[PDB]
Amino acid sequence: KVFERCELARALKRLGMDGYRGISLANWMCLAKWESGYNTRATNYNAGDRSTDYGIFQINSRYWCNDGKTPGAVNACHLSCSALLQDNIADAVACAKRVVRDPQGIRAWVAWRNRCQNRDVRQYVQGCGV
Ligand code: NA
């Protein structure tokens, strides 16, 4: 599923993402925008280390979910990576919450640093009623 901007903003707020571990909703929106373009089925193979990024937040198979083919990987979210490709984003949100529970927080995603950090991210949530 490819979510529309405000549709996604409203869903995330309902899922308790606004202010989660100090992270505003607009930041989560900026991350989803740059990682997948709000697309839940997005997958990206990293030829360099044999891992794959899954779903709306492009969560990596090396530390977060299990896809069985990634070398020396863990499954911290305790989920099959398939769970991160559903139209229902409940599991992906639960896993994203787990990711930011580590010291790096939202910085764990390089895209966030490149395109969201220190920028005016208000545009991502404007007019959505959140
Ligand atoms: Na894994």
Q: Which one from 4, 7, 53, 102 is the annotated catalytic residue?
A: 53
Within 13 Å, how many C-alpha atoms sit on residue 54's CB side? Answer: 27
**Total domains present in the chain:** 1
The resolution, in Å, is 1.8
Method: X-ray
Note whether 106 and 100 are within 8 A (CB).
yes
For the question of residue 4 being annotated catalytic, the response is no
Q: What would the two tokens of residue 80 be?
A: 């099959």
Q: Which one from 7, 35, 67, 102 is the annotated catalytic residue?
A: 35
Note whether 130 and 18 are within 8 A (CB).
yes
Neighbours of 126 (CB within 10 A): 12
Give the whole-angstrom CA distance, residue 80 versus residue 7: 26
Cα–ligand 1 centroid distance for 55 (angstroms) = 14
For the question of residue 35 being annotated catalytic, the response is yes
The CATH number that applies at residue 2 is 1.10.530.10
> Residue 89 burial by CB count (10 A; 0-12/13-18/19+): exposed, middle or buried?
buried
Distances (CA, A) of 42 to 7, 86, 109, 128: 18, 10, 16, 24
**Closest CA relative to residue 79, chosen from 71, 27, 89:** 89
Range of the domain at 12: 1-130
Contacts of 42 (CB under 8 A, 6+ apart): 35, 36, 53, 54, 55, 56, 58
